[PDB]
Structure 1
Amino acid sequence: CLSIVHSLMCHRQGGESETFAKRAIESLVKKLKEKKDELDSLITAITTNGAHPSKCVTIQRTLDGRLQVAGRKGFPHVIYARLWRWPDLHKNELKHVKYCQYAFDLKCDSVCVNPYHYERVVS
């Protein structure tokens, strides 16, 4: 589990602190512990820079839709996209790919946080 967190940490971008990244990754890995296929799809997607199409990586949607990490609240798909792909990401600059089944905009009970299931768009 620690080797998984460490391997995902190696692919973070300089958007936030090392400590924020660690807490965000630990939180996500713990939720995917009982979902082997989703965890494997996350490791493969991050490690290979989304080289091949990956499966949805989902977490339970909160009542307000935001996730809190180290005292900061934000949309979960935005947090993980900022962390591994766009460190300067803000507002509504994300558009989900047609392949993504559990995209944040699709208003499902489960939210896809796979950063390679979203693409950056102009404001």
Structure 2
Amino acid sequence: PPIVKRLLGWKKGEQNGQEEKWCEKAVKSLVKKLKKTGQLDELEKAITTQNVNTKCITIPRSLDGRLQVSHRKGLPHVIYCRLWRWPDLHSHHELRAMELCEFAFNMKKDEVCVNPYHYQRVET
């Protein structure tokens, strides 16, 4: 696929194996969804410009808050921040949504923001 490869172009920790195929799936899932809501552009933008003051990139939130990609389950913001920002990221307890983020996972709205540049990592 197109943009998927581009977005894949950005990422870190080079964790190939089945994690490589998974990372691809996870990116495709997201693209499929942003496409529908016409937010793909603002996502590519955010990724390539590392510009924090970008708009929120939103995905629907599930009842328990988790997202499944393939057979694995996790928190969305944790999955995508670990993708494009911190490959070593461990849990959502290391993540702090900034104040400009309106749909932070921590707010429990109907939509969750996964813009990797809307969260900072806390040295806990």
Q: Same fold per TM (> 0.5)? A: yes
Q: How does 1:13-32 map to 2 (within 5 A)?
A: 13-14=12-13, 16=15, 17-32=19-34
Instruction: Judging by fraction of residues, say which structure has more helix.
Output: 2
Query: Quick check: 2:103–2:113 contact (8 Å CA) kept in 1?
Result: yes
Change (3 A) 1:39 1:89: same
Report the Cα distance in structure 1 between the residues aligned to 2:96 and 2:83, rounded to whole angstroms.
17
The yes-or-no answer on 1:9 pairing with 2:8 is yes
Correspondence for 2:83: 83
**d(CA) in 1 for partners of 2:70, 2:44:** 23
* Aligned equivalents of 1:116, 1:19: Cα separation in 2: 24
- Overall identity of the aligned pairs, in %: 55
SS in 2 for 1:82: helix
Unaligned runs of 5+ in 2: none
Offset, 1:14: 2.2
Match of 1:100 in 2: 101
* Matches of 2:52 and 2:29, distance apart in 1: 25
Q: How far is the alpha carbon of 1:52 from its aligned partner?
A: 5.5
Q: Is the 8 A contact 1:9 1:25 kept in 2?
A: yes
SS in 1 for 2:25: helix
Q: Which runs of 5+ in 1 are unaligned?
A: none
**CA–CA distance in structure 2, aligned partners of residues 68 and 34 of structure 1:** 18
- Find the residue that maps to 2:35 and give its secondary structure: coil
**Alpha-carbon shift at residue 102 of structure 1 (Å):** 0.3
Structure-1 residue corresponding to 2:118: 117
Q: CA RMSD in A?
A: 1.3
Task: State the secondary structure of the residue aligned to 2:96.
Answer: strand
TM-score relative to the length of structure 1: 0.91
Report the CA distance between 1:70 and its aligned residue. Answer: 2.5
Asked if 1 retains the 8 angstrom alpha-carbon contact of 2:12 and 2:85, the reply is yes
C-alpha contact (below 8 Å) 1:56/1:113 kept by paired residues = yes
CA drift at 1:15: 6.0
Distance, in Å, in 1 between the alignment partners of 2:109 and 2:43 is: 19
Segment of structure 1 superposing worse, 101-110 or 13-22 = 13-22
Does the CA-based 8 Å contact 2:52-2:117 persist in structure 1?
A: no
